[model samples]
Target: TQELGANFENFIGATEGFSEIAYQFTSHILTLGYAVMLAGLLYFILTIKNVDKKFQMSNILSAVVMVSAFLLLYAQAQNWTSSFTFNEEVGRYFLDPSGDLFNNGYRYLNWLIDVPMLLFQILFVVSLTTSKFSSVRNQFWFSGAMMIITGYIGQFYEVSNLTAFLVWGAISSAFFFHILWVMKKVINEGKEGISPAGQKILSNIWILFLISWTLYPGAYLMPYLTGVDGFLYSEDGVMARQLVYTIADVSAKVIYGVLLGNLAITLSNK
Candidate 1:
């Protein structure tokens, strides 16, 4: 039924001409996103020994992230392509009317594995004390896990319960802010006396982190961001979200790892 409220299932099946374009774009972005992870995996593994023993951990983690991200992201695109088919005359895709809807919750599960390493890789390179290392790492683990969990909970209400969605989303935001606060301190300490190359990439990493990480939460609000009705539940909204999501994942994981790898090597050589 058209009035059966919003869910992932409703967004699946066949699509239209323009939607075909969007679908292709979304899937391609996802495919490329995961592909880059594979490429990064090779780069990190081959160059792992180029960094010092301690900094080598950064490359190793990048390899781990690349493998896992590729696994999930490929699955993500595969899920997208498998569900929708092309059709002519009638305009676009359509089917699986009463079947199970596609779920994107894989993202969080992957992030659960990733968030800690992503942050800690920097810590390993930044040369923090052992006591401070354990403390900051502990904080990142707790807050990063909480951040992902809060958003996952709120996503359940995205299509049905507005109050739960917003309330839980606010909670999620609070956690995110805490993460930013911690990250700010880390960044301040991170750059002290670093190699020129490491410093440059660190600068790049900061801006990239800001752009990619922001999109994760920002994309979630797209349905209501336009200040219009029905658009939230529209097919276009699905395409938009997918595009933003794919972009964020690539930058957040693969590209970020690449920069970290570069920084580790830079710091190692000097």
Candidate 2:
């Protein structure tokens, strides 16, 4: 049971089984999530070449994150179907003999790859001094890494202890304020940076981050949120997690890249 919380899979011989319909539903969402990520690679390629040399790496970073994001969702899609079998008697999907984990930790790993580079993307678009740029980049990386790593630590305990999961999230969340502060500085010292309107959009990127990012913690806290004693035992909770992750993946990765590319184009033209 403890292990079950970390991933969607319930251990073999466990009574928990999910419906075929719900299983199929989650499969489609993962496919959709991975599809958005796959589409982003080509999207960045076309956009990357247009930006100045300084701004180019941000799109390159977007490309890197696109692949990482794609792989994460693609792998999860496989895990969604491969690890479970439909039980006729139960009319629901149950774990096969694989015992292979479909751990949610990949998201944290994906964030490690994605978030720091994402900070790099924004910094490149701005006209910060080399000295200040280095300073800001390192701190953003530190805070982003800290924020994400704590979530990984938290999710592990999700299958075991809710209190620990939330505690780690609380710590991770502390890093977010630091990141916001840094970003504010980036806007203030805009240099020959983005226009007032562009900077407005830049600050709203935080709003974007908050909205999409909040969904993840909600997914992790589903059991407590819904007050369901055995939340994972139902197909609904598992599918809910996938849906939330899918939206966040598209919102943060795909939409973010597009926004980054558009912002770069706007800055380059100006």
Candidate 3:
């Protein structure tokens, strides 16, 4: 019994240390990412020389991404100072946390606003007629909302029910695939009107969307999978989740913003 208690205490201490380190590292990444986003926002704002609706709208949304990311990062940084509640059973500290120990409602709030805008920014650049754009826009908005809502449901469930987590996750993924399908259709139908340069930009955006968005589900699920022997549910896994999400955000918003802005400019010139 003494040996068992000592081993358990050692494990808990190691996990807490790892968790603290992970949170610090993730916070630094968010800081750097926010800086990059601000730089991108300035570039987009300064380069706007025309009254083209698409260009203006895309740039404005690019700024929105910067603002949203800034807020998200701010929320993340606050976790360091935020009061934590300890879970005796789980042996973990919840950072200003409510519901699930891993839950960060701020991230979901960020997604609620940012994800739809991310989808719209791309749709804005694509050469769609008012009718087609409206149709696609509405669909994207609905799907984006569902995706975020379902993800939040899963992430903040307050209990460790893998089945519930996966069900919500699967629903979120379905919405994700629906968004991709809509984009693919838009690309196929509208490609002829786009210049080769515009086509290349659109294609690149599609690839970025696929690569970045796909990782989100996997990251979302990593902590729920029980067979990983709890390492994935550890502070290390939480940090991994934060890092992956940050990378995806940079790719989807920052890099995608630059490309979308370029496409808008290209299309406007043509």
Candidate 4:
């Protein structure tokens, strides 16, 4: 099991001190989780025969998520490490406060690729026919891109600009809801085409995905909404944010993969 707490001494003068430690710890766990998921998805890809082409495509795209996450997390860990340096000007170690140093660009890059694939995985497994695939794919991909772009804008914004943050956040949330609506429409419309077991699994998984995704914006806004004096912006708050994000990722990516893959396997057998 992975440890949760952090040592304050090791992170002296670093912004989000204990929080950085917590983030690093969580990232390690996430990396391992994605690695395991990759292996499992690859296993299914190779061994699960006689499935719909859509099911196999879903697995392949889903595997891409694990690969992207694993690589990005590894890069994030390195970025976090590089963030800390002995500032001779101040005669102390501190985290790089500027976007230029130890930046989180890898995270957005990961989202850019993974988010689209995630949407497609759900779409593909729901049994959209070859003729409908092109249009649905274009719509979902556009929505996914909007979600990632708005989210990245919000995430990378200067904390002092609350209005810009909220605007970007709202747009991102809108994109999210749009994607959800599209997903729900597809599932409801295509429900009859799928087996009852597969339908049940997909319905449950869709709800789970919605709930898990909702947590991201909440977590993102915690520090701002709670105010500078609030606990969410404090040392403990940093840890909380990191933990929430890790949980959300596991739920959205790893667990979602398991459930969706199960649905695919179930449908393949029918």
Backbone clashes in model 1: 6
Tens digits of lDDT, candidate 4, 1-270:
212112221222254343445546644654654566557556545644645666777777766787787777667656655555555565544555542344547767887888888878876677654337777778789988998898778765535466777889899999889988877777675566777887898788878888988888877775655776766565455455556666777678777877877887787676
Residues 11-92, candidate 2, lDDT per residue (tens digit)? 3224566676777887899898888888898888876778878778888888999989899878778876776777788777
Better of 3 and 4 by TM-score: 3
Rank candidates by lDDT, best first: 1, 2, 3, 4
> Candidates' lDDT values, in order?
0.75, 0.74, 0.69, 0.67
Rank ordering of all candidates by TM-score, starting from the highest? 1, 2, 3, 4
User: Could you give me the TM-score of model 1 versus the true structure?
Assistant: 0.87
Off by over 4 Å in 2: 1-13, 129-131, 191-193, 229-233
Off by over 4 Å in 4: 1-16, 19-54, 85-93, 96-100, 128-131
| Lowest summed lDDT window (length 10), candidate 4 | 1-10
Candidate 3 lDDT, tens digit per residue, 71-145?
Answer: 776765554334344456665544432422232666678889998888887666676643477788899999999
What TM-score does structure 4 among the candidates reach?
Answer: 0.79
Screening candidate 2 with a backbone cut-off below 3 angstroms (N, C-alpha, C), the clashing residue pairs are none
lDDT of 1 by residue, 55-160 (tens): 8888888899888888988887776676565567666655434533355666767888888888878887776532388788888889998988988888888766
TM-score for each predicted model, relative to the true structure: 0.87, 0.87, 0.81, 0.79
Please give the range of 10 consecutive residues that has the lowest summed lDDT in model 3: 1-10
